[PDB]
Design a protein around this ligand. Sequence first.
Ligand SMILES: Nc1cncc(Cl)n1
Length: 283
Amino acid sequence: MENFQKVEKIGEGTYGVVYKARNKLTGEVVALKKIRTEGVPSTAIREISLLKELNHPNIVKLLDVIHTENKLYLVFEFLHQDLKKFMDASALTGIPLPLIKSYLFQLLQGLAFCHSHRVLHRDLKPQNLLINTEGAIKLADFGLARAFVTLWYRAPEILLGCKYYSTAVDIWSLGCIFAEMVTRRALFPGDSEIDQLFRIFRTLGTPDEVVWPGVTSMPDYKPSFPKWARQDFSKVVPPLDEDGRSLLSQMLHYDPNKRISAKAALAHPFFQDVTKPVPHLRL
Ligand SMILES: Nc1cncc(Cl)n1
């Protein structure tokens, strides 16, 4: 669009290309997202406009929505790095625990806010968690999945065909990201839906009616699933301490009604000693 000078292709997102651009009437540097045709659905336009009001320090600001020439562009605040690259950058040492804790705490604050207004992300992953030089982390693309690819962070209720899923799906994803920050490997790197489900089962045990009432009646559940025994969390995420492991287990409860809420996770003892360190980042 005419008011924006693209400076660089930053990536191919879920919905289209993401550019770093500069606005000419403000001089502001932004992330420009092209979405994707019938002439942009009217409901998607209405959903997106609700998102313009969903403002929080831990949510990447939706600056503008440009519906022009029957195309849709989302203009976001720009951040220089994402958690995926920072994790790759931090592979030999690992992200220090104080920083992991600060990031998780801030992300939960973001989720708690969105969840309080009944907005889910649905597709959390390291690539859409954006970090700055101030030690802040922010959720990008919040609300876009409902308004409009890796399986690694997808909740089991989604994999099992539950169509009416809750905010709990975001808590699952963030637990997976938390484990990954700690161990420097992805928790459940599935490369198909069955492989994702079966990786989850191999670590947390195949779910049954005892841990997850109603599970065997879910659309894609099969009596023929193999029955793996649950592994111990001390084997899954060493050398995370007892507080972190305790929290992680609650974030990874099979039953979405049992799974910890963002708001209850913020009160967890793990965060008793949270701080806000600044990361070392080269831009
Ligand atoms: N890659 C980027 C940078 N800033 C904001 C967004 Cl939404 N994406």
